[PDB]
Design a protein around this ligand. Structure first.
Ligand SMILES: NC(=O)c1ccc[n+]([C@@H]2O[C@H](COP(=O)([O-])OP(=O)(O)OC[C@H]3O[C@@H](n4cnc5c(N)ncnc54)[C@H](OP(=O)(O)O)[C@@H]3O)[C@@H](O)[C@H]2O)c1
Ligand SMILES: NC(=O)c1ccc[n+]([C@@H]2O[C@H](COP(=O)([O-])OP(=O)(O)OC[C@H]3O[C@@H](n4cnc5c(N)ncnc54)[C@H](OP(=O)(O)O)[C@@H]3O)[C@@H](O)[C@H]2O)c1
Ligand SMILES: COC1CN(C(=O)C[C@]2(c3ccc(F)cc3)[C@H]3C[C@@H]4C[C@H](C3)C[C@H]2C4)C1
Ligand SMILES: COC1CN(C(=O)C[C@]2(c3ccc(F)cc3)[C@H]3C[C@@H]4C[C@H](C3)C[C@H]2C4)C1
Lengths: 262, 273
């Protein structure tokens, strides 16, 4: 059972926190009395988020602007954020590259950009954050989607990057379990969220219910705080019930008696 | 010449026959050894036209020779690295010119990988995504016009590590999961765009290839399935236009791998766009 006091005094990074779900997470964390470091490209929008974080009761609030297309910026950002807060308890990996609903034809550029921003930068940010996370027995929160678990048309590049997140983070979670690394990994599988970007992208074409961004952001924080392996948040109760793969968890437990690492 | 007809009649979506590959124009990547080499050998026996690729000219030459001996209608190789996106794009054009078209594209190559705990090896994370996933995308883009012409097939070789989580294969698993997300999404696109190009995702367990046996030695203790039958099962699925192929030593694995809930969610969401 979650309690907002679990985040009181915690040192948290939130990526893509200038708008949408990311901004909402920063706001909830601020209300909880956490130390926050927010990032995105827009200095001006980040400044506004930092100001209202302080107004909500954040123990401290800072921003560092830059693009996650740059792996050097991603690595340096974590070092600077950790130096500002004097450590790190939670790393929330939320940013994605701008994407839309379009058929795939020959845009290898958009496939590469999505893999770099949505997946490779999460790996670099994890590598940079891990020593501090090992010190605090902290958590890694990875924001994904239904399109990161099941197939949908018009999101091929986006889906590839979200699936990669699962393959990578679920594999290191198994490694941490056998290596006795007390760092939790929360994969967040989300449905349609009423953010300005998502509403604009699904206008007309798609006909489905959007869930509120405020509660979504809170559910993500809850899972990370409770050290839940996975979080599921969608409008439909049919979706939430079918998204779980119990056979996958059984296969993994059956195969855990095949390797040696001692 | 003074003949015509169709191999694909009643039952041809369920029961395989080697004659379905007779005269077919097939590309096999990473075909100098392992499963890839075995696929080239089966296709040769079936009387298909084959174009093999891998980096080693010398090993590819040997594979080409054995294919011709087995009864391949034609057999050629083009050597190069799949780290090079220019080579990947040009390879398909050259292979298509050598065969006069393309019926099946078998995406099988991977970068050299081992069983090791994640250790911030960023170069291995990147090279894995590039060779194992991004080159498959470039090869697909290059091949698609000819596949559209022949109502052809794309065969994507993946792993159990491309469906479920295992330790010591983080970057490899990321690259194999990405293939699923990408190829399963475009399969849905082809269905609504009326693109008659099938996509077969192959989910393989441990296979007795020299590479895999060497890599698992003293780290992984599990039953290895024969490479010969594995290569045949992959060909079967592509020929039958099966969405997915599963091949593993354990019968418990073959029963648990399928995700019926995933197929239900997709069918439920198909009435939203
Ligand atoms: N909303 C939904 O329907 C939905 C559904 C499923 C999953 N999700 C997941 O939720 C997360 C957030 O989505 P959202 O809908 O809240 O998005 P959003 O409102 O568009 O915001 C994305 C954030 O990422 C930042 N960003 C974009 N490009 C960047 C770059 N190159 N470098 C660094 N930051 C960059 C943006 O700020 P700047 O432009 O100023 O850089 C922005 O703050 C994503 O991981 C998404 O996959 C959302
Ligand atoms: N064996 C198993 O247990 C197993 C299990 C599940 C799935 N699989 C999948 O099966 C497929 C084949 O595996 P395998 O065990 O048969 O592997 P393998 O014998 O080691 O073959 C890999 C092939 O790819 C080539 N290759 C490597 N790097 C390359 C590059 N940069 N550019 C182009 N070609 C390159 C290799 O030849 P060169 O070095 O001469 O280039 C070789 O022909 C892969 O997709 C693998 O993921 C295998
Ligand atoms: C900007 O995209 C934001 C919106 N995001 C999603 O993940 C939501 C979905 C999507 C994906 C990309 C789009 F462009 C538009 C919609 C994705 C999961 C669900 C099924 C479909 C695929 C449609 C919705 C809801 C990231
Ligand atoms: C290059 O080796 C080839 C072998 N390959 C596999 O995919 C097989 C596995 C693996 C993965 C990478 C390795 F290096 C070693 C083993 C993978 C699927 C199964 C469970 C485990 C993960 C162990 C085996 C069997 C690529």
């Amino acid at each position: 059972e979650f309690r907002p006091e679990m985040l009181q005094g915690k040192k948290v990074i939130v990526t893509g926190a200038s708008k949408g779900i990311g901004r909402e997470m920063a706001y909830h964390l601020a209300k909880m009395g956490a130390h926050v470091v927010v990032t995105a490209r827009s200095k001006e929008t980040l400044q506004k988020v930092v100001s209202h974080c302080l107004e909500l009761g954040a123990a401290s609030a800072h921003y560092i602007a830059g693009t996650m297309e740059d792996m050097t910026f991603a690595e340096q950002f974590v070092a600077q954020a950790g130096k500002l807060m004097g450590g790190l308890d939670m790393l929330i990996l939320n940013h994605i590259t701008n994407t839309s609903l379009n058929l795939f034809h020959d845009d290898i550029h958009h496939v590469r950009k999505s893999m770099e921003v949505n997946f490779l930068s999460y790996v670099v940010l994890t590598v940079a954050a891990l020593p501090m996370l090992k010190q605090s027995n902290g958590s890694i929160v990875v924001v994904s989607s239904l399109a990161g678990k099941v197939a949908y048309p018009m999101v091929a590049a986006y889906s590839a990057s979200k699936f990669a997140l699962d393959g990578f983070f679920s594999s290191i979670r198994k490694e941490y379990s056998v290596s006795r690394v007390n760092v939790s990994i929360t994969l967040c599988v989300l449905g349609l969220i009423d953010t300005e970007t998502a509403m604009k992208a699904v206008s007309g074409i798609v006909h489905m219910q959007a869930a509120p961004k405020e509660e979504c952001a809170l559910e993500i924080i809850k899972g990370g705080a409770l050290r839940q392996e996975e979080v599921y948040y969608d409008s439909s109760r049919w979706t939430t019930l079918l998204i779980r793969n119990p056979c996958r968890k059984i296969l993994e437990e059956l195969y855990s008696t095949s390797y040696n690492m001692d």
